[PDB]
């Protein structure tokens, strides 16, 4: 998971956009999403998301 985070070729991450409020995205995001970094959605957890 750590390796995938470091290895990622995508310039845009959920964390980066969410923290900076890049498209006014905090409007459609939970305050919890800042900490969850888009990995967690409700009770469900995505292991495949960086």
């Amino acid at each position: 998971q750590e390796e995938r985070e470091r290895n990622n070729q995508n310039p845009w991450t959920f964390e980066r956009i969410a923290t900076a409020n890049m498209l006014g995205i905090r409007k459609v995001l939970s305050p919890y999403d800042l900490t969850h970094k888009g990995k967690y959605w409700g009770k469900f957890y995505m292991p495949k998301r960086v």
């Binding site: 290895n7 990622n8 070729q9 995508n10 959920f14 409007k27 888009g38």
Partner: protein, 31 residues
């Protein structure tokens, strides 16, 4: 089955997907 997301949220999820690195030549093809 998951809860329906806002379209803007879903778009963000789609944009922020892990892209694995691709070498110029496949490692198997290399000696």
């Amino acid at each position: 089955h998951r809860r329906v997301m806002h379209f803007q949220r879903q778009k963000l999820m789609a944009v922020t997907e892990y892209i694995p690195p691709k070498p110029a030549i496949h490692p198997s093809c290399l000696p």
